[PDB]
């Protein structure tokens, strides 16, 4: 076929053209994002039940919903947790490959049908089905710098005036408010309530009656009296709109004609829906939007758009209010793209320079410079076609493919240049011969690298999705690089290269070039003399190969494994937990301390801290809090001492000094939502109805034993919360019935006053908003106050709550996990250093096997995945190695010669492992893909030498050692050129520091260290490999 | 409050006897109370940790400590069925006729959860069986209402 | 619960059927209302109908009828299912000790095995050959009259006294300055 | 285009002064002038 | 009594059910036992 | 039922609309609220 | 309608490029395609 | 597939006749069905 295009250069130009056009169009249209979606589809149900404890939530809501999650498809596991701020969350995790929209609507429909089985308060509140995404494009913070509006105000503003703006902004797929809009807060006073002999029940029924929508009908509605002339609507009562109105609600008319007014027993104000989170940004009140990028959207654009919209909102900001951007992935994605575009350009400047140094005519130096963009452009095409995005994974896979791309150009052009110098053939006859000499091998190389990278895409779950990115990027690049080298560069060679005289090896030139050429021709004799000696003595080299194979084996297992390196992301976070029973004030004082430390001791690095009192991973409560910390740029934080890993070490130490408060910091994972590749996720299950206390024991028993193998388990811990003192109040039915007091009166008085009670809606400023009745804090803080609430008896007397109740402390759970339907406790840990995850799990299973009967266990999370698809690697790589064999067998028409080539694989691996272990790096996906490419590329050179050698014997009848020495000579210059170019090309990634550099380091190191040894060792061992196998067979 | 007294409250609740032993070696506070008045004897008495109960009492723990609303470790023990702890506590001077702020007595609580042995022990050490709570119920009243006839018989 | 075939057709089946309109690829729709109090409406689709969307649609029109169904019928939970009429397999559960009655075995199957299998992907429907347990009150009128109470009084008191009651927190947000204690308030809970 | 509307305003205080339930008021006004769906019956085999 | 969801694979699903029942067996009360009275799937395996 | 177009818009149409954000292939979205209390919202999707 | 007009120019431009390229590839020539590609206004004027 | 040569047939009350009249109609059909056993076999209702 490459003859076809040597005679038809236009045709081939058209194919180039078309490919470049498809490429450029894909470039305008491809989605840009940090990472693809890799986590499996998860759908989280959410509900709330104001004033309710974790048990009530579970027994009335969580069980009901879980009992109904039947008949949804491709469910992997369900899990829930129910807690003491009245929240529930139920996460259904679906098989990888589920339509999240089919999955979400199936969850949503069974829930709907379960909705009539829920508490009436919970029905009134609503239950939200959502696709689970820790993937945020950015988070816009909104703060008041002049102390004029509280956190609630800011939030309401943001709700009424900013949220929907952003929602409609292009490329924004979802938006979450960090706060509530206003709510009408009635803050009752029980002294007044008892003065006029009213209860929370009267207050509620008056708000339901005087804040109503009343349908009324029409004037002159069909069917009319014929001859009516007017048809008009009748508007009767609508919702109230102001606090002034609510305060003027009539409760009681007296015997006196006076009026008890809802302002006479309660304080009325707009406020938050909850007051459970205190949020601050550098000590000032704050709210914000969390913005997720929409499907297909471009991150760099959406971000700009979000910002654009924001600016045109600023003109109407009330005084004091300011925007802040404390989290934004787009600068990463910018740097990434700029850095990859950087690398890809330096790449062609390098092949320019190396091409000229050796071949020293400009005409040749064109042929790679055309061919490389053709393939890169046409790779974006195939990317788009397969529905891929421009992301960090696909971008570095572009970088891992440069070597294979570069090489295809260098190989074809140089072998035409060499056939010319050696045979004095015109460029059309010379390329036609040169193509005849690599045309089979080049196709062979395509099949073989296929059998390298294609298996990698077929890994399962989260990890398969990350390998799928590189697999498709890299196979595409190489496949067009073979197309372009059989279609485009043959044509280009035949029609751009100037001729070369027979024998003219450029040694007669002068200056730097003529010297180089004689120097190199001397070194090609130097080289072939050396290899000819090696070939007199194969044995010590077989012994050295075993030494190499053996060192690689050792370095493999002792190189620790991760799956993606952390980054200095610009951000990190800091947990603050406090004892059972610790108040919100107390947690704010710790967060205040934590906040002060960063703005004092880390002034140089820190730009901001965002202090959320009330929230955390393990749970929620007045006694927990997260600070979120946002740093200045990597170019204003010089050197590793101002890296996150530094700043966190320091801060964690500082905070271990804090009294009655566990406080620590830590970096964010490379890919949000994934957890340690050294970690396990353990679910401990009540399997025959033991109860909370029993499962708690079985846990601590499992946690004790775990601590008795520090050699194997480390950081083995519970994920939930510990039981806590709570106030049990019992209602005397007998005293109630006797006193004429309803227990529904009792339990709504109590529930409304101390827990809050959602009544109905009102319309503030054209916006519909909630109305809550609750006590003033002053009367709902301490067990002593229970005696200040009065409930009316039938006979109208006001009976103090104490007269029919009693009370005691017990312990109880403020959070309550479940898992696939049963009660559970989630245990977390990792394998102690030097030990693998599958081991720490084996032991964790056995330690459980000796637990009380009625206690079971399962594997969830990352662990669930690796348990099901952590076995595949040696399966897959087997088929890989089999096809690679099967292919080379067909290339060379020999069952034995394959081995000569295959034997090259340790030679690249070794230096990758060496360079890794040296720089402290890790066996992760960037390293592993780079292995794959280092193998593929040194495979490439092996396949060409053996081919040239086998040819020289097959066709020209040369003896084995003769053929092998000639082969290794002709292929020396191309191999040198590719590696020198490429090695230099991956240089900036190894040296790279600052922005987003762990990714570049991971790719760079292993590819360069694997290349130094793959280049050096191969040129000698490959002729060795070939002669031992030809001899043995 | 102290670093140790909180560590002791924790170990007392959790039943980590050697922690309690080491803690008692170091003069941690047997009178440390948590946020609601529970001392580690409370914690032990409630959570059913006999060893720690003894160790604490041996180390000067107050057997007749009372919480924010009057519960004595005997109250907890009688109520959650920890016969041996009941016996120890009463041996070590636990007021068997302690009334919490509801006028609830370890007899009441025991009658109520129906711990017949614990009833008789408490009666043995002199549980006033005609004691009444806030609402005038005697452990007998609890017994007839819960439908427990053996208990009813024991309280004659 | 307790409705004859006509009460079930004229208060449920029909109300539903009149909403089952505009539904892609529907061929026919039959239904039985019987004196056990049960309805099953069976919408059948052309071959090639995507059963997921075919369910999403039927469910959509059904939730328009829901609020018009009796309160008794909603709390019994209405179901929508895409399965083959026939039985794939029957899983039997016995007791070889005889520590456990037919009624107990069934309550174990229903409370400890069913849900996980109902949640197994592939499983279009599960029929429990038996019955989960319930707290059964079995009234006696001879005594009901003897005290001048009625089934109405009973249901009222169970609703009152078998109550799971949200009751707030001590030191709950927004708290008072200087607040000491944060603890849940636990009041009535479900009976057991 | 914009229609007129007849706003009738009930006096809660006078309703309580004269002992009338705002719920019957609301139900009268609503039922009489707008209509009120009440339940279904059967017409020759059809729920209506 | 188990009915196979629309389209779903009979042999594949039988499998999944068996695996699910396996995780329960170790928690059965004394002498509780599974039995297999009606199964249409083995015939598919055998005849193929 | 029985609510002016403005009431129905504040409490129903605006609520639904502000959640019709980020949906695949949405070309535009039109919607109206009337004096009988009815609402319709029509999302139009890119042909294809 | 606004869209069909907005996209029409682009459509015409790429349809010329395609034809040209197909001509260059088929006839191995840049001249033959450029001779031909100039008859285009002759037909467009008559349609116009 | 069906039960071999089994036919499956429906009688409809297209006019509000009532359950009772439709039952007589079905009885009337079934009687005449039995009068052609050269053509019809095992003809029967499916209900109670």
Residue numbers in the entry:
A (entry chain B): 1 to 1033
B (entry chain D): 11 to 166
C (entry chain A): 50 to 241
D (entry chain C): 722 to 769
E (entry chain A): 290 to 337
F (entry chain C): 50 to 97
G (entry chain C): 866 to 913
H (entry chain A): 674 to 721
How did the manuscript describe this experimental structure?
Resistance nodulation and cell division (RND) efflux pumps are secondary active antiporters that are ubiquitous across all domains of life. As part of tripartite multidrug efflux systems in Gram-negative bacteria, they span the entire cell envelope and export a broad variety of structurally and chemically unrelated toxic substrates. During drug efflux, AcrB undergoes a functional rotation where each of the three protomers sequentially cycles through the conformational states loose (L), tight (T) and open (O). Substrates can enter the PD through several channels and bind to the access pocket (AP) in the L state and the deep binding pocket (DBP) in the T state.
For the V612N variant we obtained two crystal structures in different space groups, which represent not only the TTT conformation, but also the LTO conformation as seen in wildtype AcrB. V612N also showed a similar reduced resistance for many of the tested drugs. Among the variants, V612F was the most compromised, while V612N showed the least compromised resistance.
